[PDB]
Amino acid sequence: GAPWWKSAVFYQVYPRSFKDTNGDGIGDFKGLTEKLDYLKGLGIDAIWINPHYASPNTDNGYDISDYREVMKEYGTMEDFDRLMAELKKRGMRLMVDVVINHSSDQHEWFKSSRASKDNPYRDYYFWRDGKDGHEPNNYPSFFGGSAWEKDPVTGQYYLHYFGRQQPDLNWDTPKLREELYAMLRFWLDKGVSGMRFATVATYSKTPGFPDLTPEQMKNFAEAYTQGPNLHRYLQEMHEKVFDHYDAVTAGEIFGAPLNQVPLFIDSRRKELDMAFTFDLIRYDRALDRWHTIPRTLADFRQTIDKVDAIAGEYGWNTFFLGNHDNPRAVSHFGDDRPQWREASAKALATVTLTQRGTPFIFQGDELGMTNYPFKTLQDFDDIEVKGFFQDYVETGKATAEELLTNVALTSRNNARTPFQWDDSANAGFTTGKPWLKVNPNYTEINAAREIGDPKSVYSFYRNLISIRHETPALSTGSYRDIDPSNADVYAYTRSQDGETYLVVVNFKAEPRSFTLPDGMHIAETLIESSSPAAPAAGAASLELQPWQSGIYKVK
Numbered sequence: 001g002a003p004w005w006k007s008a009v010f011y012q013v014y015p016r017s018f019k020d021t022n023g024d025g026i027g028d029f030k031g032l033t034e035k036l037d038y039l040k041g042l043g044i045d046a047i048w049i050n051p052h053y054a055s056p057n058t059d060n061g062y063d064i065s066d067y068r069e070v071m072k073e074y075g076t077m078e079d080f081d082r083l084m085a086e087l088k089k090r091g092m093r094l095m096v097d098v099v100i101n102h103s104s105d106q107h108e109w110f111k112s113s114r115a116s117k118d119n120p121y122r123d124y125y126f127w128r129d130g131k132d133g134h135e136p137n138n139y140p141s142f143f144g145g146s147a148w149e150k151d152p153v154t155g156q157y158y159l160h161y162f163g164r165q166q167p168d169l170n171w172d173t174p175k176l177r178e179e180l181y182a183m184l185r186f187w188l189d190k191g192v193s194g195m196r197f198a199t200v201a202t203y204s205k206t207p208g209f210p211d212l213t214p215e216q217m218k219n220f221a222e223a224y225t226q227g228p229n230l231h232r233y234l235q236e237m238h239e240k241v242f243d244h245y246d247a248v249t250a251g252e253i254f255g256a257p258l259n260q261v262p263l264f265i266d267s268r269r270k271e272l273d274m275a276f277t278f279d280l281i282r283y284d285r286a287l288d289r290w291h292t293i294p295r296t297l298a299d300f301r302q303t304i305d306k307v308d309a310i311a312g313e314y315g316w317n318t319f320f321l322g323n324h325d326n327p328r329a330v331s332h333f334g335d336d337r338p339q340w341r342e343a344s345a346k347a348l349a350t351v352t353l354t355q356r357g358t359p360f361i362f363q364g365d366e367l368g369m370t371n372y373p374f375k376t377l378q379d380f381d382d383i384e385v386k387g388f389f390q391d392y393v394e395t396g397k398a399t400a401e402e403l404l405t406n407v408a409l410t411s412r413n414n415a416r417t418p419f420q421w422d423d424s425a426n427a428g429f430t431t432g433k434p435w436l437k438v439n440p441n442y443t444e445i446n447a448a449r450e451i452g453d454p455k456s457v458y459s460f461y462r463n464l465i466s467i468r469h470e471t472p473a474l475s476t477g478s479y480r481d482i483d484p485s486n487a488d489v490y491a492y493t494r495s496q497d498g499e500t501y502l503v504v505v506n507f508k509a510e511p512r513s514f515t516l517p518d519g520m521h522i523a524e525t526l527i528e529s530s531s532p533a534a535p536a537a538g539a540a541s542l543e544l545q546p547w548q549s550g551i552y553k554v555k
């Protein structure tokens with residue numbers, strides 16, 4: 001049979017922005033725990049939570065200062081234990097985020113490492129002499145400036161691919177590997193069902209740290225995935241940790257060329273179980289990560305087809321249209337204008353829930369939440385944007401205005417505005433002042449309004465989750481794009497054990513038709529959105545309303 005995770009629907013919870021229960025304006029574990037019935041009723045099998053560890057929060061949990069303690073803002077270890085127990089009560093599973101490319105610079109390992117060149121923890125991190133009067137080499141940081149920071153305590157520089165307060169951990173050091181493996185066991189021994197490995201493809205660094213070529217410089221995120229020992233380390237982690245448990249692992253394979261993805265997820269390789277890739281969600285992002293490039297449905301569907309191709313007989317993909325690092329799904333891939341938001345959000349739900357792979361729904365997407373109307377500099381506050389200011393505005397490459405107009409569309413804060421529970425003060429997320437403002441559209445878009453409405457985005461998601469669960473081909477079926485070149489109507493089949501389903505989604509705000517492949521006809525209509533009526537049994541074609549979606553069994 002297929003592992004539970006291949007037929008699961010996951011929901012991602014960004015705990016900081018999901019539900020606050022003590023009026024400090026930051027979401028927490030008690031808030032999440034209080035909302036499990038809501039997630040269970042939606043039909044969710046397992047939740048992935050963003051990092052929940054002790055953290056100075058320079059990067060909202062991705063800078064961890066103690067891997068064996070809970071972040072103070074979310075609660076205590078007891079609250080974490082209660083979350084797990086309450087999930088388990090409901091037959092639901094927890095996946096946690098694992099951030100072991102780097103720690104906080106406040107982690108005690110780093111506090112020791114920096115003390116001297118002979119410190120026992122010195123090689124828990126990468127320390128190098130400057131060269132030619134400046135940095136060890138020309139590596140840039142994702143979060144601005146050089147990836148090398150001089151520490152005058154020793155006069156050497158340490159490596160940080162991300163923030164200056166996120167020094168990279170040195171996987172070449174076996175005692176470091178052993179500490180990380182022991183840390184992973186600490187959490188898995190508590191009963192955690194899954195682990196998502198953040199930036200998993202950057203763990204291996206190239207011996208000697210030679211300069212990037214100017215080609216590599218223009219795509220340094222890819223260069224940082226090419227360390228010669230990467231798969232050696234992932235295999236060791238599996239041997240020493242995951243072989244001993246039954247937790248699912250997922251890698252956030254950021255930066256890596258798609259053709260390398262099989263090395264991470266082929267089950268025979270004993271590395272990771274499934275891939276988060278970024279080819280789709282960044283399919284319209286420029287190399288600088290902040291400009292957008294126009295794309296069409298043909299580019300969208302062709303990327304999916306390529307990502308599907310790298311999950312062979314033995315590999316497996318996740319599928320997602322949003323996460324805490326990206327704009328809102330309906331804003332990004334749909335049409336978020338008041339007249340099309342609901343219709344297009346339903347369309348994208350149909351896509352999400354009928355893809356081959358394990359779908360992850362990001363918190364709020366089931367309501368049709370949208371991008372935020374940024375109005376002030378403060379609205380954009382985020383370490384990555386601070387870095388774009390450093391790299392692009394201080395250097396005179398762009399004005400602040402150019403940067404913010406563009407980051408309005410791409411800002412990670414679009415995804416981090418509080419979840420909109422109801423139409424009370426701050427959409428019911430907090431009784432205090434939320435850490436990020438609530439989107440003003442919460443008067444219209446909120447869970448309490450949608451749950452009771454048969455025609456809401458929520459109810460559609462719920463109904464799609466039910467259909468997928470009921471229908472094996474829709475989870476583990478083969479996938480085939482009916483016409484990769486079509487830029488109007490996305491259509492595809494899922495097949496398993498001699499049953500074939502057809503998914504058809506108009507991405508245009510206009511009527512369009514669709515002719516089924518010769519020899520194929522409609523047998524039954526499982527569900528549709530924005531349709532006035534279902535096709536007649538035997539139909540060789542369909543008339544589509546704007547943004548209409550449907551799933552059909554064919555014959």
Ligand SMILES: OC[C@H]1O[C@H](O)[C@H](O)[C@@H](O)[C@@H]1O
Pocket residue numbers: 059062063099162198199254324325
């Ligand atoms: O840790 C640095 C970054 O790593 C991953 O890309 C995370 O998904 C992102 O939120 C984080 O800032």
Ligand SMILES: [Ca+2]
Pocket residue numbers: 020021022023024025026027028073
């Ligand atoms: Ca709180």
